[PDB]
Design a protein around this nucleic acid. Structure first.
Ligand code: CA
Ligand code: CA
Ligand code: CA
Lengths: 149, 149
DNA sequence: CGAAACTGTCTCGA
DNA sequence: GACAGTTTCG
DNA sequence: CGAAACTGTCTCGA
DNA sequence: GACAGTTTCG
């Protein structure tokens, strides 16, 4: 699905302000290298304005709204739809464009990263770069912690 | 000056996210009715990203960046430039469009409001409406304060 | 006096 | 805003 | 095992 | 984010 340009321009601005482009390395035993690579695009907002987030679900056509008390979040983690959405939002981002590029880069190498432990490690390096660009304050698992395999 | 539409669309999203459209009644004895009507359009951002706010100064062509430690703000209070700017931005706002329109209405009434204590009081009630629309939490001076006066 | 800059800060809403 | 830790399903 | 949902929370950056 | 209070200066 191809999004409206004016919608993407406005959303890019809103994302640069209240959105988050997240890449995580989740320790999980059921996964090959004992870790799951997780990529998330989200937009946070006061629950009293949940209608704005619900609107994103309709406009983007995928994802959902999570409720966490007085705050809610629009969340999109499905890989294929994420790649399609971010590819279209990337040209308009100003503060988080680098993060969007790294996420797209990661997505495009996910298949081949699920083979070589070295390849996976490299991709985890890209995840570190995203965290370094965001205002990260509580990160634990890094490519270093993953190197313990 | 006429701003570029694609810039206005992105900025409208950024503002709805991290900006603020503010109207205030400031008690000050050097003024006619003992209060100054103050209007402000601002965009807040971590000082590390001050370059983004500086760019806004260059783009908008007026206003300035204030520094308050780890946080900084783009600030536009000059009335004429503010009216011109909000007039062009308001069509693209989704969360703060009402506040922008009330500010525009206030500006247009300023000359006239500087005459009738009753008219100045009315304009002050429009200030109250803007505050009600914002996520106001520390407000003190309202139209009621002004009328006691 | 009045337009606008300068400075400070509560309470979240990211 | 930006994570963390855990569970569900084909 | 991998994709994706579900649920909680630190520390600000608005 | 959204105010409050102070000071400058034409
Ligand atoms: Ca922000
Ligand atoms: Ca924000
Ligand atoms: Ca916001």
């Amino acid at each position: 699905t191809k999004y409206n340009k004016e919608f993407l321009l406005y959303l890019a601005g809103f994302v640069d302000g209240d959105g988050s482009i997240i890449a995580q390395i989740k320790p999980n035993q059921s996964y090959k290298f004992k870790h799951q690579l997780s990529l998330t695009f989200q937009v946070t907002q006061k629950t009293q304005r949940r209608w704005f987030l619900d609107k994103l679900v309709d406009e983007i056509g995928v994802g959902y709204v999570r409720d966490r008390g007085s705050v809610s979040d629009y969340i999109l983690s499905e890989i294929k739809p994420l790649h399609n959405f971010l590819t279209q939002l990337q040209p308009f981002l100003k503060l988080k464009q680098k993060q969007a590029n790294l996420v797209l880069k990661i997505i495009e190498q996910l298949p081949s990263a699920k083979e070589s432990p070295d390849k996976f490690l490299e991709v985890c390096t890209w995840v570190d770069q995203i965290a370094a660009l965001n205002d990260s304050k509580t990160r634990k698992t890094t490519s270093e912690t993953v190197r313990a395999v």
